[PDB]
């Protein structure tokens, strides 16, 4: 599958 | 830790996944979402954080 990551400030 | 998203191969929306889902099928669709709220291609894509 095509995935990505993005910043999550809460963690 | 970051947020993982997967793209639906049918509708091209990005869907958040739980952390640690490190194995996915070659093609993935909204219908496979573990979250029932985002399990239909008609549900709008969630916004990213600011
Ligand atoms: Zn879809």
| CA distance linking residue A2 with residue B16, whole number of Å | 12
* Contact between residue B1 and residue B19 where contact means Cβ atoms under 8 Å apart: yes
CATH topology of domain B1-50: Herpes Virus-1 (3.30.40)
Going from the Cα of B35 to the center of ligand 1, the distance in angstroms, rounded, reads 13
Residue ranges of the annotated binding site of B for Zn(2+) are 8, 11, 30, 41
User: Domain boundaries in chain B?
Assistant: 1-50
Under a CB-based contact definition with an 8 Å cutoff, are residues B33 and B25 in contact?
no
**What token pair was written down for B38?**
């985002």
* DSSP string for residues in A1-11: --EEEE--TT-
How far apart (Å, rounded) are the C-alpha atoms in residues B34 and B50?
25
Ligand 1 mean position to A2 CA, how many Å?
13
By Cβ distance, the residue of B7, B27, B49 closest to A8 is B49
């Amino acid at each position: 599958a095509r995935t990505k990551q993005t910043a999550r400030k809460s963690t | 830790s970051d947020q993982t998203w997967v793209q639906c191969d049918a509708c091209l929306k990005w869907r958040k996944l739980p952390d640690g889902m490190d194995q996915l099928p070659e093609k993935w669709y909204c219908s496979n979402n573990p979250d029932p709220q985002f399990r239909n291609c008609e549900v709008p894509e969630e916004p990213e954080d600011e």
